[PDB]
Design a protein around this ligand. Structure first.
Ligand SMILES: C[As](C)(=O)[O-]
Ligand SMILES: [Zn+2]
Ligand SMILES: [Zn+2]
Ligand SMILES: [Zn+2]
Ligand SMILES: [Zn+2]
Lengths: 328, 308
C-alpha cells in the first residue's frame, strides 16, 4: 500500500499535503504531441507548469493527483518531467472522462476493466509509470457506456486496491447514481471520491453520501465566473458561485461531523485545449494563485471561521493518504 | 516531388498507387496506450508488412494512408512498415469522423494552421510531412464538417497538396462538398470526392468528373462496383478515376475483432485491386494503357503538389 507516482512508489509518510483533483494539462489523447504550438510550445507549457507547481510547493503542497485520463490527453511524460523539476509528487490516473474516442467507447465492460488494469498493473503506454487512481465521469442520467465505465472502475479497484474519483456535472446529484452502481459491484464507498461536489449547496445530498463513507470532492474551490458575466463560456465552465461559497461547504461538512470524508482541491490546470481557445487565460485571471489557492487562500479562510488547524491538517494530509493508499 | 514517410520522392518513383488505404484504423494515442488490443504493436507491424509485401508483389508501389490524427495515425508505425515492405506511404492530415474536443472546438482558422503544421513542418516530432488532406463527411455535410472542408481548401491552396473526402452518411453529398470547395477558390483537380463506389448513380458521378473532380471508388457485389469504373471510362473520364480498397491491417474504432470479419470477406487485402479488379476490367475489354492511366498516371497527377 505504497502509492504509485510518476517518479515511482512512495510511502504514505511522504505524501504530505495533497491536492487530490488537479491537472497539468486538460487536452485530448495525442493532442499535445501533434499540436504543441497550440500551447505556445511544449517547452512553454512545461515551464509554466513547473513554475506553478513550485509555487504550490512553497505554499506547502507535497503531492497532487492528476486526474487526467487517456481521453483528457494525459501525457505521462509531461507529468514526470514537471514532477521532477518541481519536486512535487504527481499521481497519474487511468479511467475514462467525458470524451472517449471510438476505440474506447466501443469497448466492453470486460475490455475497459483490462485497460484500467494495464494502466495500474503494468504501466501507462511504454513508460512503466503505473496509475494510482481511476478516473470516471458522468453528466446527467448515466449513459449505458458510462455505466460500463463505472463497473469497470469498480472491478479494477477491487482487484488492485486503488481508489476511484468521479466527475459529476452538477450536481445534478450524480453521486447517488454512481454510488448505486459502485455498490452493486461490491465496491466499498471508502474507495470512492464523488467529485465536483462543491458545485451544489445541497447539504442533504452531500451529508448523506458522506454518512455512507464516500469521500466528498470539494475540488474546484477557486472556480468562479463572478465578474465575468459578459463571458458565457466562463460562466458555463466555472459557474456563478463564489469561491467562499464553495469553501463554506468544507465548514458545513466539518460541522456535521464529516471532516474525515472531505477532500479539497483547485481542479486547476496549466494548459487547456479541450474547451474554448485561450480559456487558460480566463481561468488564470480569476485565480493567479493557481494550485496554491487552497493552501494560500482557503486554509486561512477556514481557520478564520474557527476551524482548528488540526482539522485542516486532517483534511489536507490524513484524508488523502487514507484515500490514495491502496486497500482491498 | 511528393512527401512520403521516408522523405520526398519523385513522380516517376510513385508507380502503381492505392490512393485510399490505412495501415491501422484507430484513435489518437490508442495504439501506444493499449497495443495489446492488436495483440501487440509487434504483431500489427508483422501483419502490415506481410500485407504490404503482398500488395507490392501484385504490383503496388505506393499507398496513401488517409488516416488522420483522430483515426489514430502513427507515422512512426507507417515509417516502420514502409521501410520493411519497400512500399511508399503518403501520410495524411485533416479530420475524420471522431475529432476529440481539442479538434472539434477549433475554428476554421485554427484547423487551417494545424493542417499546415502537419504538411509544412511535420507530424508530431518526426519531421514526416503530410502529402494529402483528409476530410470525412456524413449526410449533407454538418456545420463542423463544413469548417473542416474550408480549412482543407485553405491548406491545399497554400501548399498544393490535394484533398480527399470520404462519405459514410450517404446522400449525393459530393455536390455539397463541391459547392464548399469551389466557394473557397479550390480547383476541382485538387479534390478526390470519395467513396463514390457506394452509389450506382452514373449521371451524378459523370457530372462531378466533367467539373474536374477526381472520383474515388473503392471497395472490396464488387463486380457491379467494378463496372462503374468501366462506365466512367466509357463516358470519357478515365483521367478522373481513382481506385482503392480502403483496407487496413488493424482496426479498433469499431467492434472488437471486426478485423477478422473484414479479413474473412477479403482475404486478398490491399492486393484485391491488382489481383481481382484489374483482371476483371481487362476481361471486360479495358486496355492496358487505360488501366495504367488509372493506377499510375492519375495518382501521380493528383498527389504532385500544384496550384495550377
Ligand atoms: C477537466 As474538469 C472541468 O472535468 O475537472
Ligand atoms: Zn471533472
Ligand atoms: Zn478535473
Ligand atoms: Zn472513409
Ligand atoms: Zn478510409
Amino acid at each position: 500500500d505504497r502509492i504509485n507516482t510518476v517518479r515511482g512508489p512512495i510511502t504514505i509518510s511522504e505524501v504530505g499535503f495533497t491536492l487530490t483533483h488537479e491537472h497539468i494539462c486538460g487536452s485530448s489523447a495525442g493532442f499535445l504531441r501533434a499540436w504543441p504550438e497550440f500551447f505556445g510550445s511544449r517547452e512553454a507549457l512545461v515551464e509554466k507548469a513547473v513554475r506553478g507547481l513550485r509555487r504550490a510547493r512553497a505554499a506547502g503542497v507535497r503531492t497532487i493527483v492528476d486526474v487526467s485520463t487517456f481521453d483528457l490527453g494525459r501525457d505521462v511524460r509531461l507529468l514526470a518531467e514537471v514532477s521532477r523539476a518541481a519536486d512535487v509528487h504527481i499521481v497519474a490516473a487511468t479511467g475514462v472522462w467525458l470524451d472517449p474516442p471510438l476505440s474506447i467507447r466501443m469497448r466492453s465492460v470486460e475490455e475497459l476493466t483490462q485497460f484500467f488494469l494495464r494502466e495500474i498493473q503494468y504501466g501507462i503506454e511504454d513508460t512503466g509509470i503505473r496509475a494510482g487512481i481511476i478516473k470516471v465521469a458522468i453528466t446527467g442520467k448515466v449513459t449505458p457506456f458510462q455505466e460500463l465505465v463505472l463497473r469497470a472502475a469498480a472491478r479494477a479497484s477491487l482487484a488492485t486496491g486503488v481508489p476511484v474519483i468521479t466527475h459529476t456535472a452538477g450536481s445534478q446529484r450524480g453521486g447517488e447514481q454512481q454510488a448505486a452502481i459502485f455498490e452493486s459491484e461490491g465496491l466499498s464507498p471508502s474507495r470512492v471520491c464523488i467529485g465536483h461536489s462543491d458545485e451544489t449547496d445541497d447539504l442533504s445530498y452531500l451529508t448523506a453520501l458522506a454518512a455512507r463513507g464516500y469521500l466528498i470532492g470539494l475540488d474546484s474551490i477557486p472556480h468562479s465566473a463572478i465578474g465575468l458575466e459578459d463571458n458565457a463560456s466562463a460562466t458555463a465552465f466555472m459557474g456563478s458561485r463564489s469561491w467562499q461559497t464553495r469553501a463554506l461547504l468544507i465548514k458545513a461538512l466539518i460541522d456535521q461531523g464529516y471532516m474525515k470524508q472531505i477532500l479539497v482541491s483547485n481542479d486547476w490546470l496549466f494548459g487547456i485545449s479541450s474547451y474554448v481557445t485561450n480559456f487558460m487565460d480566463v481561468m488564470d485571471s480569476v485565480n493567479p494563485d493557481g494550485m496554491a489557492f487552497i493552501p494560500l487562500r482557503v486554509i486561512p479562510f477556514l481557520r478564520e471561521k474557527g476551524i482548528p488547524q488540526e482539522t485542516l491538517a486532517g483534511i489536507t494530509v490524513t484524508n488523502p493518504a487514507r484515500f490514495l493508499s491502496p486497500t482491498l
